[PDB]
Amino acid sequence: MDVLSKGSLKELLAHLEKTPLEEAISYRIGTVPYQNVLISRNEYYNQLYPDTTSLIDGVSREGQRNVNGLIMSIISYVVSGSGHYIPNIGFMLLRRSILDILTKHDTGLVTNNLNYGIIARNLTVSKMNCEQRKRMLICFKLLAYKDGNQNDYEIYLNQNIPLKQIAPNFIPGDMRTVIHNQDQLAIVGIPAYRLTQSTELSIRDDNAKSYKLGYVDWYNSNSFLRERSEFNLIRLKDRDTKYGKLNGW
Amino acid sequence: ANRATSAFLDNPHPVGVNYVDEGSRQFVAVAELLASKLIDSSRESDESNSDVPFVQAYSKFADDNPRHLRVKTGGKMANALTNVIRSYYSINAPAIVPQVEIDRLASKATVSGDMYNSYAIFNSVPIVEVLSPARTTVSIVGSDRADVTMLNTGAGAANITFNFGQIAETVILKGSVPFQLARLNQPMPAARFTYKLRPLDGPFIVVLPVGNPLVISATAATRIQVPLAFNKALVESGFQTAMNDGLFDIQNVNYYSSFDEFIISQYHAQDGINRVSTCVILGLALQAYDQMRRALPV
Amino acid sequence: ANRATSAFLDNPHPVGVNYVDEGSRQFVAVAELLASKLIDSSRESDESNSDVPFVQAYSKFADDNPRHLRVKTGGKMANALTNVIRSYYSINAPAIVPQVEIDRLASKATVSGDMYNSYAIFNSVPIVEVLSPARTTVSIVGSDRADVTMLNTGAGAANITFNFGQIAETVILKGSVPFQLARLNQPMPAARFTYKLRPLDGPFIVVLPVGNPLVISATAATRIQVPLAFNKALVESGFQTAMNDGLFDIQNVNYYSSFDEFIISQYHAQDGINRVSTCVILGLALQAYDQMRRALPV
Amino acid sequence: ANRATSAFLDNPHPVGVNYVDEGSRQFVAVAELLASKLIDSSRESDESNSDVPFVQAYSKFADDNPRHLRVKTGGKMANALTNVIRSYYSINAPAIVPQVEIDRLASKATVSGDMYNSYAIFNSVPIVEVLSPARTTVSIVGSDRADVTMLNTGAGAANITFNFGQIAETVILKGSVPFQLARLNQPMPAARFTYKLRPLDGPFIVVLPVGNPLVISATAATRIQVPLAFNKALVESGFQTAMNDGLFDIQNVNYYSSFDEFIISQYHAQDGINRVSTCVILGLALQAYDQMRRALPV
Amino acid sequence: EIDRLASKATVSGDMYNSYAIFNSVPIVEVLSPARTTVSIVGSDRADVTM
Amino acid sequence: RFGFRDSPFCTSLPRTIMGNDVRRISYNVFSMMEDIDDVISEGFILYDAY
């Protein structure tokens, strides 16, 4: 919910710096990812409604124990709000931030063998919307810069024409590029249209609307932080600053 | 059967898919307008004792005041235009310029980014294929004017099939000696020097006697929608310049003698309708590059 | 003996004998002036973020106020300009436009209508005839640059007679290899690459040695009196548009690649002095068509 | 071995050495600026039905008021401009205009007089030499687009060496059929239709198969520094007028079809850089000549 | 009479403002060789039996 | 019908008078004209305004 609310590149990377990896990993068993299932949608149909479960749903799924599953759990958390079930990763890796895993070699995780095409296909890039594809491409660029695979990232964009048009423009080592970026990455937000307490047909759409309706409740909740009215009560370390720089950028 | 085709029509490379939105099209139009004023302001200052008109024009274009000991390069607008030209030519070229810089530079002038309010005529001759029987030789030479030299060493007359595509509007055929040409499965008319043909009519059959060589000269006219500010003379010189400074040097791309050949070759691809829209924006950008670089050589 | 001639010089069709009077020539000049105002007003309206300058220019041209839910054809002036273009090309084309309408449309501006106050240079190469003896082959290809390939199969040197007409001012001859050329009853000079010739001097003889074929490239220049507003770039573009739009589609006519070929072909025919006067008026009308159609596509 | 060379590159004649100083350069720039105003006033007078705009412009240009029953030649500026064009072409042409007359005429308008501010692109393709084995025959035709026809009558494949000089920036080679081309001491690639080459890289080798003749079309782009007011369309028109008016005809001078051929040939001769500098001043003088002569046909 | 009636209301006489889609199938010719039978039936939906 | 002297009312504004077509000028074009004295020598019809 909090990760889906971020609407700018600066906010997204700032959230990932303060968020540990354990938030990406889920400890609920879930179900196997790719299955043709029948779900109940009584608002629309009397018969059961066919659908296919996927990894970018908002509900936890079972994940492979390899490094591929860990990266695929991080991206699903960013684009869908929930991760997958990969237990016994370890204290050392789980305490690191999401940005450290994606960008830093000191974590101890080796990810240079990853194939962006296979990861995108397993995440069902075809079913993703524009904001979801932009968020995943941000994760790919950070991984490419960590492994020195910038050339491979560009070629993968050349093969996929729709991905090249929406590819965010920022150098993963320079903070000046992040501040200038004006891409809108928000998935949930205050809706200008009429939003009703009604169900959706597919699993992805229904789960997304739950976060959208939950965010509205979160926005008016006491947990939400109102910068306009309570800026002085925020701690100085985590207070918003114009000259905000990620470490090493 | 032997197949002969025009050289420039072979394997058009994919063009870039970036900077084709309405915001980016406005920036290209703005750059063309500000480049035109840079040329005019330099000439006015040359014919006067004051440099104020050139200082004002360069300051708006480059966002910096000119200095005596520093090279006048054009500033951020020059860098943005140079990189944007690179992206249009090839899909393999990266998209370096941020959208924020493009939007900010587009706010310097007030021009619509419309790219379809006018039209232009391009003179390349699209000979897609010429099919000839055995014991005959066919040679195709030239792009602006296509000369086909054909010889018949066989016993009898031979029928040659000419395919001019479906994009060109009018093709004018001229021969060294009178010859016979007709559409497929149609009676053949009397021999005459000149033929006006619509390429949509179909493949054309030419009767080739065994006596002497017959050379057919082809000229074609095709109409492509362009912005009103389009000027063919400035685009062609801008095309030649951008190739010289290496703006088109990128792996796995084709090279063309003129912008006329480039736009016609891409039009004849499978997705030619989608490709010409990007090439038109490239032409206007090449027009701005010509004027800007002539005023500020580096 | 064999005879070879330029293809575009063969059988020029008669041109129209209507709309050549002083009042009609003023209408063409008015149409060109007002059409140029349309293009400039369109570019003025884009920078000013208003459509008023284009509206007033269109109202002057079309005698009607633009409407959002009506097509901008161009008004009565556009229809009259299209019909006069048809009449000029062929004597068989009807003269639909009445004289009263022509006079009313000529009152919009105050142009003189003179068609002889300037000059233009035309680059079509006239080769009336090439006389070759037996055992030699001669081929002519091209109009703006004529390449003549002559091959000698016999055992002795052959003399080829060149006739460039009496109209062209200068002709420049360049050969693939050095060759000998001289006039009638004149000594042969040493072989050299380039010859400058005056077509009025007389028939020329080229010594053709036995062996590899010799190719001669011919370039010509001709001076024709034109109005001051004449612009060859706009005229050539308007010629292609008129041909694609079918304005020249009429029985018993000969088609050409360019307006340069059309005007030279008529000038080399008999009574061609009177023909070029009508062709020049057609050229100015084609200039108005190109400017009007680019501002108001249909 | 057989050697083939382009025709227009053969034997460039020496250019004149007068009227190249700073004051003389200012005179040509002033003449160009005043000639542009002469042709603008002529158009304005026609559209305004008043001779006042033309009278003012002619008086400044010619130093006398226009009068009926007089020729309206152009005054002392016309004579000086005509004579300096003669001197630039050949070193044998005498210099007639005194420096006092040049300096007085240069004071009419304020101009920089610098001929190296901007650049222009010239499209003449230089083929300095083509070296071929005994069995093969090579012919070169054309200057703007050069077509090289090669035929192999020997037993095996042959190597043809192409030398394009060192001045041209980019050369594009297109063939009727795919051919093999590579630089010296470089592996030969697969057959392609088109190549993009840098003449500075070195001699290029073409593999010529035995089967059928191969025609290679060559296009080139060359950058020459010119003043900002340079306009290639006006210069080319002025060059043809200069030849027709017979001010280039002197003893021992080569003749060219276009100003492009003239300037490129001088570039490839000895002391080419110094020769090209003089030819640039001739080009601007020819631009002024074309505008003034079209305004005042004499 | 036409001019008098046309003055009753003011409306643009433009007939090129918009477009309409027409569903007739223009089978100009169907060429068949010997020993084959071809029949064409229908205009909205053309049924060709060979 | 009404018996007026020199009636300024026509049943419909004529397209042709005495076999000759009447000039029709829009008001916007009529505003910018410079030869109205000559134009008014023969009748004209004005429209495109209230």
CSV table of C-alpha atoms in Angstrom, one decimal, chain B residues 137-286:
chain,number,residue,atom,x,y,z
B,137,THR,CA,19.9,-9.2,-69.2
B,138,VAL,CA,18.3,-6.5,-67.1
B,139,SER,CA,20.3,-3.8,-65.2
B,140,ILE,CA,18.8,-1.1,-63.0
B,141,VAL,CA,20.8,2.0,-62.3
B,142,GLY,CA,19.9,5.2,-60.4
B,143,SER,CA,17.4,6.3,-57.8
B,144,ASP,CA,16.1,9.8,-58.8
B,145,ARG,CA,16.0,8.7,-62.5
B,146,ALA,CA,16.0,4.9,-63.0
B,147,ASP,CA,17.6,3.6,-66.2
B,148,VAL,CA,16.8,-0.1,-67.1
B,149,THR,CA,19.1,-1.5,-69.9
B,150,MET,CA,17.7,-4.7,-71.3
B,151,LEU,CA,19.0,-7.0,-74.0
B,152,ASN,CA,17.4,-10.0,-75.7
B,153,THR,CA,19.8,-12.6,-77.1
B,154,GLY,CA,17.0,-15.2,-77.5
B,155,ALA,CA,15.3,-16.5,-80.5
B,156,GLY,CA,12.0,-14.7,-80.0
B,157,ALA,CA,10.5,-11.6,-78.2
B,158,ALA,CA,10.5,-11.6,-74.4
B,159,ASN,CA,8.0,-10.2,-72.0
B,160,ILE,CA,9.5,-8.3,-69.0
B,161,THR,CA,7.4,-7.6,-65.9
B,162,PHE,CA,7.8,-4.2,-64.1
B,163,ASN,CA,6.6,-3.7,-60.6
B,164,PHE,CA,6.6,-0.2,-59.2
B,165,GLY,CA,4.8,-0.8,-55.9
B,166,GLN,CA,1.6,0.7,-54.7
B,167,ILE,CA,2.8,3.8,-53.0
B,168,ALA,CA,4.0,6.1,-55.8
B,169,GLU,CA,1.3,8.1,-57.5
B,170,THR,CA,2.7,8.6,-61.0
B,171,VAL,CA,5.5,7.0,-62.9
B,172,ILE,CA,6.7,8.4,-66.3
B,173,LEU,CA,8.4,6.0,-68.6
B,174,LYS,CA,10.7,7.1,-71.4
B,175,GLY,CA,12.6,4.9,-73.8
B,176,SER,CA,15.5,5.3,-76.2
B,177,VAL,CA,13.4,3.7,-79.0
B,178,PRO,CA,9.6,3.2,-79.1
B,179,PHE,CA,8.4,0.1,-77.2
B,180,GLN,CA,5.2,-1.6,-76.2
B,181,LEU,CA,3.9,-1.7,-72.7
B,182,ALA,CA,0.5,-2.8,-71.3
B,183,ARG,CA,-1.0,-4.1,-68.1
B,184,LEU,CA,-1.2,-7.8,-67.4
B,185,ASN,CA,-3.7,-9.8,-69.6
B,186,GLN,CA,-4.4,-6.7,-71.7
B,187,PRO,CA,-4.0,-6.1,-75.4
B,188,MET,CA,-0.7,-4.4,-76.3
B,189,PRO,CA,-0.9,-0.8,-77.8
B,190,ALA,CA,1.2,0.7,-80.5
B,191,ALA,CA,4.9,1.5,-79.9
B,192,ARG,CA,5.5,4.9,-78.5
B,193,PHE,CA,8.2,6.8,-76.7
B,194,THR,CA,6.5,7.8,-73.4
B,195,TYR,CA,4.1,6.2,-71.0
B,196,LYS,CA,2.3,7.7,-68.0
B,197,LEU,CA,1.4,4.9,-65.5
B,198,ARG,CA,-0.4,4.7,-62.2
B,199,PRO,CA,1.5,2.1,-60.2
B,200,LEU,CA,-1.8,0.9,-58.7
B,201,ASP,CA,-2.9,-0.3,-62.1
B,202,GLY,CA,-0.8,-3.5,-61.8
B,203,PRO,CA,2.4,-5.1,-63.0
B,204,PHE,CA,3.3,-3.9,-66.4
B,205,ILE,CA,4.5,-6.1,-69.3
B,206,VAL,CA,7.1,-4.8,-71.8
B,207,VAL,CA,7.7,-6.5,-75.1
B,208,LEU,CA,11.5,-6.7,-75.8
B,209,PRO,CA,12.4,-7.4,-79.4
B,210,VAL,CA,15.7,-9.1,-80.3
B,211,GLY,CA,17.2,-6.3,-82.4
B,212,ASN,CA,18.9,-3.7,-80.2
B,213,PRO,CA,19.2,-2.7,-76.6
B,214,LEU,CA,16.3,-0.7,-75.1
B,215,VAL,CA,16.9,1.6,-72.2
B,216,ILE,CA,13.9,2.8,-70.2
B,217,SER,CA,14.2,5.9,-68.0
B,218,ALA,CA,11.8,6.1,-65.1
B,219,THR,CA,10.7,9.1,-63.0
B,220,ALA,CA,8.2,8.9,-60.2
B,221,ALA,CA,6.4,11.3,-57.9
B,222,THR,CA,5.0,10.4,-54.5
B,223,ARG,CA,3.2,12.6,-52.0
B,224,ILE,CA,3.9,12.4,-48.2
B,225,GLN,CA,2.2,14.6,-45.6
B,226,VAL,CA,4.7,17.1,-44.0
B,227,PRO,CA,4.5,20.1,-41.8
B,228,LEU,CA,4.1,23.5,-43.6
B,229,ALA,CA,7.6,24.6,-42.5
B,230,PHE,CA,9.2,21.7,-44.4
B,231,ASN,CA,11.8,22.9,-47.0
B,232,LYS,CA,13.2,20.1,-49.2
B,233,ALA,CA,16.4,22.0,-49.9
B,234,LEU,CA,17.3,22.6,-46.3
B,235,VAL,CA,16.5,19.0,-45.3
B,236,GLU,CA,18.8,17.5,-48.0
B,237,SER,CA,21.7,19.6,-46.9
B,238,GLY,CA,20.9,18.8,-43.3
B,239,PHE,CA,20.9,15.1,-44.2
B,240,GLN,CA,24.3,15.4,-45.8
B,241,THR,CA,25.7,17.2,-42.8
B,242,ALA,CA,24.4,14.9,-40.1
B,243,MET,CA,25.9,11.9,-42.0
B,244,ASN,CA,29.3,13.7,-42.1
B,245,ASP,CA,29.5,14.5,-38.4
B,246,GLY,CA,28.7,10.8,-37.6
B,247,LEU,CA,25.1,11.3,-36.3
B,248,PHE,CA,24.1,8.3,-38.3
B,249,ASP,CA,27.0,6.0,-37.4
B,250,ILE,CA,25.3,3.1,-35.5
B,251,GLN,CA,25.5,-0.6,-35.9
B,252,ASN,CA,23.2,-2.6,-38.2
B,253,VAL,CA,21.7,0.2,-40.2
B,254,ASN,CA,21.5,1.1,-43.9
B,255,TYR,CA,22.9,4.3,-45.5
B,256,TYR,CA,21.2,6.3,-48.2
B,257,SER,CA,22.4,8.9,-50.7
B,258,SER,CA,19.6,11.3,-49.9
B,259,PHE,CA,16.7,11.9,-47.6
B,260,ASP,CA,14.4,11.3,-50.6
B,261,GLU,CA,15.8,7.7,-50.8
B,262,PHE,CA,15.5,7.2,-47.0
B,263,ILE,CA,11.9,8.2,-46.7
B,264,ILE,CA,10.8,6.3,-49.8
B,265,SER,CA,12.7,3.1,-48.7
B,266,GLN,CA,11.0,3.1,-45.3
B,267,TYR,CA,7.6,3.8,-46.8
B,268,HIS,CA,7.8,0.6,-48.8
B,269,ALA,CA,8.4,-1.6,-45.7
B,270,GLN,CA,5.7,-3.7,-44.2
B,271,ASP,CA,4.9,-1.0,-41.6
B,272,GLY,CA,5.7,1.9,-43.9
B,273,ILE,CA,2.7,4.0,-42.9
B,274,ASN,CA,4.0,4.0,-39.3
B,275,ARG,CA,7.6,4.6,-40.3
B,276,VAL,CA,7.0,7.7,-42.4
B,277,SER,CA,5.6,9.6,-39.5
B,278,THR,CA,8.9,9.2,-37.6
B,279,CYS,CA,10.9,10.1,-40.7
B,280,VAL,CA,8.9,13.3,-41.2
B,281,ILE,CA,9.8,14.4,-37.7
B,282,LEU,CA,13.4,13.5,-38.6
B,283,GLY,CA,13.3,15.7,-41.7
B,284,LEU,CA,12.2,18.8,-39.7
B,285,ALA,CA,14.9,18.1,-37.1
B,286,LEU,CA,17.4,17.8,-40.0
